[PDB]
Design a protein around this ligand. Structure first.
Ligand SMILES: Cc1cccc2c(-c3ccccc3)c(C(=O)O)[nH]c12
Ligand SMILES: Cc1cccc2c(-c3ccccc3)c(C(=O)O)[nH]c12
Ligand SMILES: Cc1cccc2c(-c3ccccc3)c(C(=O)O)[nH]c12
Ligand SMILES: Cc1cccc2c(-c3ccccc3)c(C(=O)O)[nH]c12
Ligand SMILES: Oc1cccc(Oc2ccccc2)c1
Ligand SMILES: Oc1cccc(Oc2ccccc2)c1
Ligand SMILES: Oc1cccc(Oc2ccccc2)c1
Ligand SMILES: Oc1cccc(Oc2ccccc2)c1
Ligand SMILES: Oc1cccc(Oc2ccccc2)c1
Ligand SMILES: Oc1cccc(Oc2ccccc2)c1
Ligand SMILES: [Cl-]
Ligand SMILES: [Cl-]
Ligand SMILES: [Cl-]
Ligand SMILES: [Cl-]
Lengths: 205, 206, 205, 206
């Protein structure tokens, strides 16, 4: 596309996009065009407004575009063209990316004992309400644990809320502990674009 | 994919999908899996149910899957696997395609007079509330008018309702009437995937 | 989107799109913009050309846009803006939809005998090389046969060529013939957006 | 979907996916199913193979699935079901995500002088050949520069190669230098999903 300002917009929150170069208040010669999950190619929005789009996005008195509560379908491109009192045309181009932060992840199941030298199910971590999905990461004593790296295995499931579209992640960690290591290791789970309480199992030689 | 029964489901209407080979009532060994606009790959649904999915699709006592009101996002694939009393497994595979019929199309503007031998704007037709979009067709004396036929030109605009996702179509017809033709032709507009407009009958000058 | 001319373009065939209002030959003040399966939002193409896009679409001397062989990814929107010798701006807007016609469908398996009053597998029809997929229809004595209509059952499979993206369809027809009907019915299969040879089984009362 | 091993596969490189629990060599009771950019829902692949798919993915003697050179359209889900000698079934489920690393980013234009207290165009950075697109980040004296921070503005353009589908990024940085700061700041550009540019060191006037 064209040169644009990247905007990250949280779902459920308002968004105001500036129409650069527009007169401070009406009358203004300006037009907004957007191409999002709600449109078939470009949709034109004018200061007059009207219709179904008045429930979604409206042009404010200062010419800015206002969305009262961003949704997944508002991802896309938003552009304004305005004329100033003289007659200079000014363009504003925005690439809008939407997101949602999940709740704190939690460990829903965990082993209290691990046996060194054999594979063990360490635990299951769940995260609810992210957009886009993201992924869950595991940590050992505060250091990242790399999946499928000869001893560490991670499997993950992604499910979508049928109405909101937000993602729930469920990740399972298996480890083969090395003999002669820490007997009370600390494991934790985090959401990769917060972190869980650490679980502290016992390891046997 | 696999061999499936094609199902067409109207938006807003209920849908019942049969789980072939399931026992008539509980207990039943059966499982539904669906992959639609609402899922990340396959979602498993069981007779027990529960959770957010109970507002969208639930397994009935006879093992069928029931959606109270189909939406655009229910397009996709729906499968059941069941075991009968004897113990034979039976699979059911459905490809669900969703649609909505628009209201009757309307002519929102039309010429009352056309001049033969020059291009004329005949009229504008609008259709609201289709899914998928479809297209608008023009007719002259009950015969189809083919766009871009050296004399017939058609332009069309498709807009999407920002909350329902249903389409509104707006089509403009221009024609160059041939000298020595019908002086009172009849034009009509139709929705193409009743649904035809009242005909307009302008006057043509030689 | 905006008011556009709908263009249907066959895959593998050239496409020429007119830039209305452009001067007949250079120099011309004109610009093409396209948004297709090949682009991230709008891509601008100029008469000078250059780069990777010269293998796909180029502006001709008369200002028209030329694609030597349309592919699936050329579906989308194509627009031109030009200035004439005076200075009138003219816009051209095209919505391009791509397709491919399959080969003649064929019956790959068929019953030679049907028993009235019970379900029978009548036959299997295959169509190769369509885009978009389309569907296969069955006919009895030249009349359409409606699927899942208490006596008629149709199942269909759609597969995609891994490299070309063209679709292969396979449809199976089952019928429960009505007692006291035609003893030598004629069935045929057709591609719905040609037709097969009719199969003519024998029916028993 | 279901519980799966996440696999990251570089475009143009081979990929081997293990069919867990399959016998080491034929005969094997196993089946692969994949749903990717190349398929309409699930495609079944067998050890026998054959057809157009033999140019893309084939089952090896040990039952693993092999793709000689991954492409963008191989993103998706790959599953195996096998039976061992005893007779136990084992399933393998993979979620395959494809990527490509761009070339080293470059500064294609830069200011040699900046004026404190006014907005200045610092430079333009370009990255070619990423998948998915990614983004370009700017740094000042090794610290991240946050866009739209009342004084820092960044605009970016993403273009797609019309035949390979790989992305080219172009990012422009503008800053309003604060009076009384470093007179020879160092700016650099980096690719964000080595891959950092040489730093530019303009002069700033008070
Ligand atoms: C490249 C670029 C950046 C910012 C705005 C625009 C507009 C536009 C937006 C609203 C109204 C009229 C024109 C256009 C166009 O459509 O030509 N291009 C733009
Ligand atoms: C090819 C085909 C047709 C109809 C149903 C299925 C199921 C299934 C559906 C629900 C529960 C368990 C299995 C599967 C599978 O997943 O193997 N394949 C199927
Ligand atoms: C609504 C409509 C119809 C046909 C062409 C255009 C262009 C355009 C195309 C190429 C170059 C410059 C402008 C624009 C725009 O971008 O404003 N809108 C258009
Ligand atoms: C949930 C899950 C994990 C891994 C493999 C499978 C298979 C499968 C794959 C290839 C062949 C036969 C079955 C199925 C199914 O289709 O039921 N479900 C699976
Ligand atoms: O929608 C509107 C409302 C008022 C004036 C207007 O005029 C412009 C058209 C295009 C670009 C800039 C200005 C457009
Ligand atoms: O975009 C919207 C959507 C709904 C209503 C609306 O009208 C307002 C007037 C004053 C304050 C806030 C909103 C504007
Ligand atoms: O035929 C099947 C296939 C898979 C599982 C199954 O067992 C279930 C019973 C109730 C609910 C969900 C699953 C029965
Ligand atoms: O790409 C080009 C090449 C030459 C002239 C030109 O000037 C225009 C810009 C936009 C619209 C119409 C004309 C654009
Ligand atoms: O769009 C293209 C693509 C490849 C080559 C090309 O150059 C030609 C010159 C003369 C005749 C035909 C083609 C134009
Ligand atoms: O474990 C399985 C699951 C499904 C089918 C199967 O039998 C096949 C043997 C060879 C090739 C394809 C299928 C074995
Ligand atoms: Cl899901
Ligand atoms: Cl729209
Ligand atoms: Cl397929
Ligand atoms: Cl592009």
């Amino acid at each position: 596309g064209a040169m644009a300002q990247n905007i990250t917009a949280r779902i459920g929150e308002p968004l105001v996009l500036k129409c650069k170069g527009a007169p401070k208040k009406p009358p203004q010669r300006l037009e907004w065009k957007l191409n999002t999950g709600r449109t078939e190619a470009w949709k034109v929005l004018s200061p007059q407004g009207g219709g179904p789009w008045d429930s979604v996005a409206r042009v404010l008195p200062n010419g800015s575009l206002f969305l009262p509560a961003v949704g997944i379908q508002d991802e896309g491109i938003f552009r304004c063209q305005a004329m100033n009192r003289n007659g200079k045309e000014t363009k504003s181009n925005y690439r809008v990316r939407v997101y949602q932060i999940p709740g704190k992840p939690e460990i829903v199941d965990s082993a209290s004992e691990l046996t060194a030298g054999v594979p063990n199910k360490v635990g299951t971590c769940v995260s609810e309400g992210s957009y886009p999905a993201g992924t869950l990461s595991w940590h050992l004593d505060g250091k990242p644990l790399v999946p499928n790296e000869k001893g560490v295995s991670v499997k993950e499931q992604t499910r979508r809320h049928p109405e909101t579209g937000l993602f729930t992640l469920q990740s399972e960690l298996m480890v083969t502990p090395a003999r002669g290591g820490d007997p009370r290791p600390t494991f934790s789970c985090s959401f990769s674009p917060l972190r869980t309480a650490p679980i502290q199992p016992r390891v046997w030689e």
